[PDB]
Amino acid sequence: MQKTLEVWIMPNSPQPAEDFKALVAPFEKAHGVEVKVTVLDWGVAWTKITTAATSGVGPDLTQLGTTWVGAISAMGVLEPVDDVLEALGGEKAYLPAVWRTTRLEGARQATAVPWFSELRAFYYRTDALKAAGVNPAEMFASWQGFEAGLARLKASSFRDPETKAPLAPLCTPGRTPRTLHNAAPWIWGAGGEIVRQAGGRWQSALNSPESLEGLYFFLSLAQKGYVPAESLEKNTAQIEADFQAGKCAVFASGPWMIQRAQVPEAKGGFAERTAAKNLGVAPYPAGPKGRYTFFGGSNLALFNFSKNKPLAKELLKYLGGPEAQVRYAQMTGMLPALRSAWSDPSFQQNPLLRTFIQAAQFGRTYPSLAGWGGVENLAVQHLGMAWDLVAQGRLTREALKDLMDKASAAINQALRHHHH
Numbered sequence: 001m002q003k004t005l006e007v008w009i010m011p012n013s014p015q016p017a018e019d020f021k022a023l024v025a026p027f028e029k030a031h032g033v034e035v036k037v038t039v040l041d042w043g044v045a046w047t048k049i050t051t052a053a054t055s056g057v058g059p060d061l062t063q064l065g066t067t068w069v070g071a072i073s074a075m076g077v078l079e080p081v082d083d084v085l086e087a088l089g090g091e092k093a094y095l096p097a098v099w100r101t102t103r104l105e106g107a108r109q110a111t112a113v114p115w116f117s118e119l120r121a122f123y124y125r126t127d128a129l130k131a132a133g134v135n136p137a138e139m140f141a142s143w144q145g146f147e148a149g150l151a152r153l154k155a156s157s158f159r160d161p162e163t164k165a166p167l168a169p170l171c172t173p174g175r176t177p178r179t180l181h182n183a184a185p186w187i188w189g190a191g192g193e194i195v196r197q198a199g200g201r202w203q204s205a206l207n208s209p210e211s212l213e214g215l216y217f218f219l220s221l222a223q224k225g226y227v228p229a230e231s232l233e234k235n236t237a238q239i240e241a242d243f244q245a246g247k248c249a250v251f252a253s254g255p256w257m258i259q260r261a262q263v264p265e266a267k268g269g270f271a272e273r274t275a276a277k278n279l280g281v282a283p284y285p286a287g288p289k290g291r292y293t294f295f296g297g298s299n300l301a302l303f304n305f306s307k308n309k310p311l312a313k314e315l316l317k318y319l320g321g322p323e324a325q326v327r328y329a330q331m332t333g334m335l336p337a338l339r340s341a342w343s344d345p346s347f348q349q350n351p352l353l354r355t356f357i358q359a360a361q362f363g364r365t366y367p368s369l370a371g372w373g374g375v376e377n378l379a380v381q382h383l384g385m386a387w388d389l390v391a392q393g394r395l396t397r398e399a400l401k402d403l404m405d406k407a408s409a410a411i412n413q414a415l416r417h418h419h420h
Ligand SMILES: OC[C@H]1O[C@@H](O[C@@H]2[C@@H](O)[C@H](O)O[C@H](CO)[C@H]2O)[C@H](O)[C@@H](O)[C@@H]1O
Pocket: 042, 064, 065, 066, 067, 068, 118, 295, 296, 297, 298
């Protein structure tokens, strides 16, 4: 009789269950096991996972967002996977920002195996920068170059061949629960942080001088006319759609847009569009205190009530390992989490994907706190109010400071009270 393993995943790929079943079919055959997959919507998965964790009933493996690893690990419900990670090549096999997501911050044992990385870089219209007299090498080198490039893009008379209208210089979604990930590289490039250990415990640093310098630099680009009114009312998918449709000269996204530019609109791509034929990528520009690439993605964890921890760890080694890494990155439009897979020809032969791997060298993640969930909720609430002021042209350094002072009080309260 076939042995059984159960895995919970989120919708990472176009046919989530079918793709995952294709991914693991070789493992199934090699180990005489049927891997049962259950797909959870991103918005319901956290509660289903915490219900599994406290009830002691659930799958053998679950996908976790990198930002969830601290909270679940602090519940004491995850099997240590230092063995699996040593098998896959240890600390040196991962970018440091990815390695940080294998455990609760400061914890003795690893509780999650890196599966795939989300990262962000700037897509840009090669045609629009040429017409505006902007060298992408200079525009994406520094904050000064970035803003000077947007000023040249705003002044340009260039029109999209299909829309027959001007392009907005920069699009950024102002209506998203993931708004903190778009702010994070500006906070970081100014020498700031969302949280910092201050007198030995974690506190908000959103109201630090450096955090406020970075956030004002980014949010003030909208107030200067570089981001349209309508973008601040849109979500991540709607901004991708606006770039595909020729409305934006520059926007931040992940690697999946490259594949989408190769596929016809009938298959959900944008190969027919001017943007697909005039596509550039550059990493985030260097701020005054450094250059940082937002990293996220997903890991896999083993529940300590699993009835077959040895076979589950063979599946973690398979999913974390070279061949499965490349294949699942292709399926999902993400990067491999395993650093050795960044040298696969399927990343090396495409110049746009080579640029993503250059951006990956600056990768940075949030601290893996047990309380991260509450921190991010509160940060997003107050960043939402800051974007609201941007819409009215009423974001001053003082109004931003007042909002991040409110966020910091609330975050510090949440961090003190986190239940164990
Ligand atoms: O906040 C949970 C996790 O969110 C992950 O991002 C997901 C995107 O990659 C996917 O495209 O959309 C879903 C639905 O909005 C996102 O949740 C991040 O990659 C993780 O780092 C994060 O823990």
